Amino acid sequence: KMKTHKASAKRFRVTGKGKIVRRRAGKQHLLAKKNTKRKNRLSKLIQVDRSDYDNVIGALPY
Amino acid sequence: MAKGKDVRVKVILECTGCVRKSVNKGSRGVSRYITQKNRHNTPSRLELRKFCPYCYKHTIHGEIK
């Protein structure tokens, strides 16, 4: 029963093992002109270290 | 346009395939998937290059006459 961080929930999505699979960056419409075979290597990876504070935020939202 | 610190603009155009679509965008100020950049000032006009779009492979491409 605590104010769950929304702007954070609309970003990350707890996979299953409690990992925070955060999509790549600079991918959203790119906005960085051409990237040549770069925008293709952009999918969804996992965060490390800092992830020990990004998951605690949305502890309730799971 | 005259180059310099005043009013510049990246001369970036597109190259849509003949009577086709995909691998290219069509709007007011948008660039294709390959994002081509012409010279404008330098003797150019009428660009085209056979590229491989979505539907089938290899076509014509090159919009803006």
């Binding site: 702007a7 929930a9 970003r11 999505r13 991918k27 959203q28 990004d54 | -």
Partner: protein, 154 residues
């Protein structure tokens, strides 16, 4: 039991404030979590599926039809289930659907209310329905549904 709080007296004489000088008052989250950590958001922001989805998983894990009112001993799955039910009370979603899982299958069976997939067609064919993949050579038109399950109306 009591790590040593209750006050601050004892050994080493604690002084709180991390013994340096940050935020003596709790709540002062140094360095907001949003900025510097708010990477490009796209995967999350969506349109939100209309389906209420009161349960991440399907109706259950293949437990329909069982001695008792936990399934209505008629294989229907509506909202009168106890042992295994979509919700403690039931009736609050849309489409049922289910797959295989743990459990010694089911002696009696008469699957209904949609549902399909080999998961509940080849394993739950001992009674009620069975696995039937409508071929694509019979009709000249595109394949008719990926998997068609008999006895399940619509």
């Amino acid at each position: 039991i009591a790590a040593g709080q209750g006050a601050s007296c004892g050994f080493g004489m604690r002084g709180q404030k991390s013994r340096s000088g940050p935020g003596i008052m709790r709540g002062f989250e140094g360095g907001q979590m949003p900025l510097y950590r708010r990477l490009p958001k796209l995967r999350g922001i969506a349109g939100g599926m209309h389906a209420g989805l009161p349960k991440y998983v399907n109706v259950n894990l293949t437990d329909i039809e069982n001695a008792g009112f936990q399934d209505g001993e008629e294989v229907s799955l509506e909202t009168l289930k106890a042992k295994r039910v979509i919700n403690p009370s039931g009736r609050e979603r849309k489409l049922p659907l289910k797959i295989l899982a743990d459990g010694e299958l089911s002696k009696k069976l008469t699957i209904k209310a949609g549902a399909f997939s080999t998961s509940a067609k080849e394993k739950l064919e001992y009674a009620g329905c069975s696995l039937i993949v409508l071929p694509g050579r019979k009709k000249w038109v595109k394949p008719s549904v990926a998997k068609n399950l008999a006895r399940a109306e619509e």
